[PDB]
Structures are given as C-alpha cells and as structure tokens.
Amino acid sequence: MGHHHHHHSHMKRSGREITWKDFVNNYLSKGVVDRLEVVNKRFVRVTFTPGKTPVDGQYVWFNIGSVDTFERNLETLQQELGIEGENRVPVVYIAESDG
C-alpha cells in the first residue's frame, strides 16, 4: 500500500532525472503519460496515467530552463507523432514561491 509513506517530507524535486529523448521514446509515445506539470518553471514532471505507477512508483522529470523551448518542441513533437486533441498531453503550469 503506497498510502503509508513519508507525507511530512519535502518533494525531493519529483523523482528520477531523465532526458527529453528518453521521455519521448519510453513514455510519451507509449501513452503512459497523463500530463506534463511544469513545476516552478525550473523543470517539468512527467505525470504517469493513474494506474501505471503510484506516488511510490517514483515519477520522472527533466530540466527545461527555457519554458518556451519546451513548449515549441512539445507541440511540434505531438504533430509529428500524430497526436490529435484526444492524445494531446495537458501542460499544467506550476510555480510555488516556496521553491
């Protein structure tokens, strides 16, 4: 049960640091990605579809720096891989001043 874990602990970034190319091939094109949550605009968390991996399943992430560059590449990437409205991966902008 992933319910009993360290709740009173800081978000250790997100999880495992991956590259954009690894993201595309092993996750994005496989449809196992639900959404891309851009946390504090520093990086993007690859959110897995609820069922594939739990919270304890340890989510993956990648640094972008240039949020603009991330978005241009993502929307191009989607139109290349034939992603239409249903497979379009929702981009959720996150920015807590705490981080």
Keywords:
99 residues; alpha/beta; name from scop; five-stranded mixed β-sheet; 5 strands; hydrolase; Structural Genomics; MPP; monomeric
Helicity level: 10-25%
Rg, nearest Å: 14 Å
Strands ordered across the widest β-sheet: 1-4-3-2-5
Give the N-terminus to C-terminus distance in angstroms: 29 Å
Strand element count = 5
Question: Which CATH class is shown?
Answer: Alpha Beta
By CATH, the topology is: name from scop
Q: Give the CATH architecture.
A: 3-Layer(aba) Sandwich
Count of runs of 4 or more consecutive helical residues: 2
The helix/strand series, from N terminus to C terminus, equals EHEEEHE
Largest sheet, strands/sense/barrel: 5 strands, mixed
| Count of domain modules | 1
Structural class: alpha/beta
PDB class: hydrolase
Keywords: PSI-Biology, Mitochondrial Protein Partnership
Assembly: monomeric
Entry title: Solution NMR Structure of the mitochondrial inner membrane domain (residues 164-251), FtsH_ext, from the paraplegin-like protein AFG3L2 from Homo sapiens, Northeast Structural Genomics Consortium Target HR6741A
